[PDB]
Each structure stands twice: as structure tokens, then as C-alpha cells.
């Protein structure tokens, strides 16, 4: 399925994912696409920062959903 | 000064803050108003997660700015 991953600064990308993908797996796809290290990524859905070892299905993330990506880097 | 705190798929509130307030101080004000424990709050500006020991002025957060709030639950 496709999801959208959007920053709060208005940048949107699409990703191909499966319900059984972990949030960590999604971070790995974002790193492949955009170069951002997983430790610098925080993914958000339903107002909550998502736990890395849980899956998209665990969070009831549906096709065409938007996840938000927040960056985390010391001094930024 | 007044700032807004918006939770991503939830509510918007106002807060009264000072430029010298630390992010930890702002979390405390959100707890006073909303009951959310500070350790579970993550505040966001310019697309990134803010750090507890830095102040609003450190990020050039000014009057009528918006901070986004997301929740990081206990384990």
C-alpha cells in the first residue's frame, strides 16, 4: 500500500509499505529515499510518536494515510 | 507573550510564556493546563523536536507562534 510521509515544514513523499512493516522498517525506507538516519526520525500518527518495534497494522494505519515525520538532531 | 500549542490530531490551546522560558518550563505550563506529564510531551518547531534545556528565544519563537505537540507514551 501507499502512505504519505509529511514534514511539518510541508515536504511530502510517498512510500510503499505493508501493514506488517514495523515503524523501524518505515524509517529504513525513509533513509533509503531521503538519506535521514533512523535515529533522527520520529514518526507520528493519531497525535502520538510511534514506537519503533510496532507495526503499521498495530496502529491501524490504512492505505493512503499520512504519517508525519519530525526530525531530531542535537542543536537543531 | 501568547503562543499557540497545537496537538497534531487534536486540540489547540493558548499559553502565556516568556522568551526566556525553557522548553521544560513550557511543558510544565502544558501540564498545569492539560494534565499531560512533561516526560510524555514532545514539542516541535521548524519541523524538529525541541530540547528541554533551550529557551523559546533560543529558537526565535516569538509572540503568536505555534508549537506542535505530540505525545510519547510510557513504554
Curated annotation (Swiss-Prot), chain A:
Site residues, Interacts with activating enzyme: 54, 72
Protein name: Ubiquitin
Annotated source species: Bos taurus (Bovine)
PTM annotation (ADP-ribosylglycine): residues: 76
Sites annotated Essential for function: 68
Domain Ubiquitin-like: 1-76
Function: Exists either covalently attached to another protein, or free (unanchored). When covalently bound, it is conjugated to target proteins via an isopeptide bond either as a monomer (monoubiquitin), a polymer linked via different Lys residues of the ubiquitin (polyubiquitin chains) or a linear polymer linked via the initiator Met of the ubiquitin (linear polyubiquitin chains).
Cystine connections: none
Swiss-Prot record, chain B:
Record-annotated site: Interacts with activating enzyme: 54, 72
Free-text description of this protein's post-translational modifications in UniProt: Phosphorylated at Ser-65 by PINK1 during mitophagy. Phosphorylated ubiquitin specifically binds and activates parkin (PRKN), triggering mitophagy. Phosphorylation does not affect E1-mediated E2 charging of ubiquitin but affects discharging of E2 enzymes to form polyubiquitin chains. It also affects deubiquitination by deubiquitinase enzymes such as USP30.
Parts of the chain that traverse the membrane: none
Crosslink site: Glycyl lysine isopeptide (Lys-Gly) (interchain with G-Cter in ubiquitin): 6, 11, 27, 29, 33, 48, 63
Site (Essential for function): 68
Residues found modified as Phosphoserine: 65
Described purpose of this protein according to its UniProt entry: Exists either covalently attached to another protein, or free (unanchored). When covalently bound, it is conjugated to target proteins via an isopeptide bond either as a monomer (monoubiquitin), a polymer linked via different Lys residues of the ubiquitin (polyubiquitin chains) or a linear polymer linked via the initiator Met of the ubiquitin (linear polyubiquitin chains).
Protein known as: Ubiquitin
Gene name of the record: UBA52
Shown residues in whole-protein numbering: 1 to 75 of 128
